[PDB]
Ligand binder design. Structure first.
Ligand code: BTN
Lengths: 271, 70, 69, 125, 135
């Protein structure tokens, strides 16, 4: 640890201008990317980030930084590459980075904007199930402090993988732009209202307009952080500028953890 | 008298230069001397997280010593 | 290799360069709509945009050469 | 209202929800507490903890019951305030029960919130 | 305390009533009961139906009184509806607080089979010098 003088006052009193720049980072359009390094460098001390495997599987960013002098490992989805989907390579990258941090007692901070897994027969044939389960295993096994910040999307199985509460995330916070759902509204509506869309297709109604209206309703009702917050999968929904303060305060709280686990010789991680 | 003093090894300041110097050095002092308020809290200490063989000698020389050393 | 290639199947929504323009690594080359994201494709190397082979609306496939530098 | 489909509008909506958590069964219930000369559960936490130290968990929780029409009335926080802070500079976990929400009776979500701060305290020592 | 701390195999058979805080004390699932079974006559509820209907459907019984209805007959009919709907093993079984509802004759077999399953248990608890039981 480095010595750092902690600023006195609440998280809301200690906001800097660099913190306030997070409030406008997320584009209004759901399909506009942003560079996740803009978040990483603002939550880390001195903007100093040591990226690891920067040239590999750039859809996920991993590396070291300090929060109030404490070394932390970052694992963050990268919207500018493959829309931030998880894939085989990003899974194996993040999985071994997490296991190394956990071996050496380094806390992990996850920054989440993941739409799902990268679709494709090549991913299926090269073993996305088996090799993606490595990241689940690494995160579930890890007993360091685990903090999740959700910025925008956390859908489906990728929600589970990227630091869900029941996978043992110690603290989960979401930005107001977070979108936590089983699947995108287009797919969900095409399923939940299949009977109505086919009935409209019988009647010759404007099935496209109906589908778009149902999708708008589903997005406005469910594709947000608040259902998860209502069930306590998200511990707080916070203004983005609060993120640095929340992370530093949670890491201070979690600096000592005891987790009971069944006795084993060693585990049996997917290989 | 066996304290190590500040020595002006070269140069001969006037009283006002000595006063300015000592005031600056004292302002540059390291703050409170040591963190005497530091308290023992062994909760979740890393040595408790390790797997030890049931017959491991590190149970004596690592685990036990870390808990017992004061 | 100097080829800038489509990282996935998508539709070209924007072209951010012109042939004969110089570009530097990280400069925007094209915007492809794929997976409901306006993914940027950016220059991997410094040089000049040559052989620009894309137009707005092009439903280009994965691996299609956008240009070479 | 800022367009709820914009990042600024979503941030404004979050601030609105947070404000609603300060008086989840209306301001007249807070008035009744003060008229009885009691503190609210929130004031009790803020008075015990060091000033500015409180971090709330599950502030936006709502109950999931549909028996006997409870689904018609879903106060924010389900009637307990939970979180952590410091007392004399040392971290503590805290819960405070809010008698103005159903008389402070324990529901499923109220209970789950207490269980979460218990687990946090037991985990962190 | 004693029930919660116990780490031996703990089996619960509910024969008829298990109300309120006494349901919590007498070997509830979330107090770490390994197997909870209930007879068909089990009655698992927050409180007896008279008190429950004295509370929910209060106001309704009071406007029945203001309208001059036979509120004692209404209170009886509400009691019966509450008893028939809720005062049984099945709401607890639906929430999995009861692992099975069984014919009473099955009790010896279920207990024997559960004790054989639970003959080896690992349960992990935080480290302490000792607990602080109420005294
Ligand atoms: C139409 O709704 C868009 C189809 C693509 C949905 C995205 S693609 C990447 C994510 N992974 C997945 O399975 N669905 C998501």
């Amino acid at each position: 640890l480095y010595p750092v003088a902690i600023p006195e006052g609440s998280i809301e009193e200690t906001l800097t201008d660099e913190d306030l720049e997070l409030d406008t980072l997320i584009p209004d359009s759901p399909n506009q990317p942003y560079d996740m390094h803009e978040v990483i460098t603002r939550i880390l001390d001195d903007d100093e980030f040591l990226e690891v495997q920067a040239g590999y599987a750039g859809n996920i960013v991993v590396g070291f930084g300090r929060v109030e002098g404490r070394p932390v490992g970052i694992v963050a989805n990268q919207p500018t590459q493959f829309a931030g989907c998880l894939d085989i390579n990003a899974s194996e990258k993040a999985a071994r980075f997490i296991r190394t941090c956990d071996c050496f007692n380094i806390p992990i901070v996850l920054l989440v904007d993941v739409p799902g897994f990268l679709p494709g027969t090549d991913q299926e044939y090269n073993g996305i199930i088996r090799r993606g389960a490595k990241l689940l295993y690494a995160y579930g096994e890890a007993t360091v402090a685990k903090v999740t910040v959700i910025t925008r999307k956390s859908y489906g199985g990728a929600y589970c993988v990227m630091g869900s509460k029941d996978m043992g995330a110690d603290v989960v916070v979401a930005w107001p732009t977070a979108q936590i759902a089983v699947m995108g509204a287009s797919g969900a509506v095409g399923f939940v209202y299949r009977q109505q869309l086919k009935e409209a297709a019988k009647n010759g109604e404007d099935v496209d307009a109906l589908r778009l209206e149902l999708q708008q309703t589903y997005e406005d009702t469910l594709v947000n952080p608040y259902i998860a917050a209502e069930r306590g999968y998200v511990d707080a929904v916070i203004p983005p500028s609060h993120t640095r303060g929340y992370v530093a305060n949670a890491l201070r709280l979690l600096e000592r953890k005891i987790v009971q686990m069944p006795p084993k010789k060693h585990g049996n991680i997917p290989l | 008298d066996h304290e190590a003093h500040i020595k002006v090894l070269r140069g001969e300041p006037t009283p006002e230069e000595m006063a300015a110097l000592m005031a600056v050095l004292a302002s540059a002092g390291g703050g409170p001397a040591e963190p005497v308020k530091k308290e023992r809290n062994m909760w979740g200490h890393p040595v408790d997280k390790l797997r030890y063989s049931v017959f491991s000698w590190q149970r004596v020389t690592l685990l036990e010593r870390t808990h017992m050393r004061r | 290799g100097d080829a800038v290639t489509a990282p996935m199947q998508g539709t070209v929504v924007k072209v951010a360069v012109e042939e004969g323009q110089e570009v530097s690594a990280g400069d925007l080359v094209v915007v492809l709509e794929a997976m409901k994201m306006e993914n940027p494709v950016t220059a991997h190397k410094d040089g000049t945009i040559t052989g620009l082979a894309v137009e707005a609306g092009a439903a280009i496939t994965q691996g299609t050469v956008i240009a070479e530098i | 209202q800022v367009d709820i489909h914009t990042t600024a509008g979503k941030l404004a909506d979050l601030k609105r929800r947070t404000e609603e958590t300060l008086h989840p069964v209306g301001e007249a219930a807070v008035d009744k507490v003060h008229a009885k000369g009691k503190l609210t559960a929130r004031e009790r936490i803020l008075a015990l903890l060091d000033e500015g130290s409180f971090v709330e968990l599950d502030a936006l929780a709502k109950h999931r019951s549909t028996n006997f029409g409870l689904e018609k009335n879903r106060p924010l926080g389900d009637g307990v305030i939970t979180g952590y802070g410091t007392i004399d500079g040392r971290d503590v976990c805290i819960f405070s029960q809010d008698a103005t929400v159903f008389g402070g009776s324990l529901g499923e979500v109220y209970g789950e919130k207490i269980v979460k701060v218990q687990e946090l305290a037991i985990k962190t020592g």
